[PDB]
């Protein structure tokens, strides 16, 4: 002999929420700009020799 059991209306399960996400594009390396280093080096010599 068993105890009777009647199944009621199912309770609400927690709802899942999907998401669409777009990633940030990486930074770009700065191209190699260049100073005329030798020009100022000759310069400081000339003013000194004067």
């Amino acid at each position: 002999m068993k105890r009777g059991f009647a199944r009621p209306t199912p309770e609400k399960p927690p709802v899942i929420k999907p998401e669409n996400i777009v990633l940030s594009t990486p930074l770009s390396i700065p191209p190699p700009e260049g100073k005329p280093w030798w020009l100022i080096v000759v310069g400081v010599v000339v003013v000194g020799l004067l």
Partner: peptide, 18 residues
């Protein structure tokens, strides 16, 4: 030698340069 070396360095800056 002082005027001479000076005069050569000045020449390089004004003619070629950058």
């Amino acid at each position: 030698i002082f005027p001479l070396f000076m005069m050569v360095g000045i020449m390089m800056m004004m003619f070629r340069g950058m």
